[PDB]
Design a protein around this ligand. Structure first.
Ligand SMILES: *[C@@H]1O[C@H](CO)[C@@H](O[C@@H]2O[C@H](CO)[C@@H](O[C@@H]3O[C@H](CO)[C@@H](O)[C@H](O)[C@@H]3O)[C@H](O)[C@H]2NC(C)=O)[C@H](O)[C@H]1NC(C)=O
Lengths: 59, 96, 47
């Protein structure tokens, strides 16, 4: 579609001065996060240790 | 407001020596500790050990990390701990 | 020649964007797969 250079310059100009230490909307409003989960399998239930295993895709 | 936080944090972390404790050469730094026990799992007689999960919190004053002009407490990303001095606390009777 | 290969490799790796797949805007990249089974060393019915 567009040249690979276009996406490359977009990617390397995305970061610039970002400072991932700070959350989005810091000091303005709480950051709203929407959570999604897909349960691949609920593993064995270990009654002896009072625990159960679970495999998930968490988004 | 964002750029003010940018400048403040960059100023705070500029010229910071992690190798030196707060108030190096002065009186000792006071560290206030508290714990929140989440569970005690396996008190084993045969092994002579207890497993324990907990939230361990430490508080200490550091003049280098003092800022003004921002009226709110700053919660930074956890990886910033790599750029800061932290006390060398450890648990003496630990096995793992 | 040896040196021809030596700077040829550096020419290849230079200017390579790891972040983009081959044929980023083009058709999908076809990935063939082989498996050489060394051993199945355990089959637990318990777990
Ligand atoms: C930034 O963080 C600090 C530290 O947690 C916050 O200060 C603390 O705020 C609480 C709630 O306002 C104070 O608790 C109250 O204090 C009074 C007077 O001592 C006491 O009678 C109450 O029972 C209650 O404990 C707490 O004292 C205060 N910390 C100190 C050292 O004074 C501050 O509010 C936070 N600011 C923002 C904008 O998030």
């Amino acid at each position: 579609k567009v040249p690979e250079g276009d996406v490359t310059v977009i990617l390397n100009n995305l970061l610039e001065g970002y400072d991932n230490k700070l959350r989005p909307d810091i000091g303005v409003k709480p950051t709203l996060i929407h959570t999604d989960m897909y349960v691949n399998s609920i593993g064995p239930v270990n009654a002896i240790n009072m625990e159960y295993t679970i495999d998930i895709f968490f988004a | 407001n964002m750029s003010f936080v940018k400048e403040t944090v960059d100023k705070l972390l500029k010229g910071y020596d992690i190798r030196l404790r707060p108030d190096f050469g002065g009186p000792p730094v006071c560290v206030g500790m508290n714990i929140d026990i989440a569970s005690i799992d396996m008190v084993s007689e045969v092994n002579m050990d207890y497993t324990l999960t907990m939230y361990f919190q430490q508080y200490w004053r550091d003049k280098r990390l003092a800022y003004s002009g921002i009226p709110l407490n700053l919660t930074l990303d956890n990886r910033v701990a790599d750029q800061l001095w932290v006390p060398d606390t450890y648990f003496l009777n630990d096995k793992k």
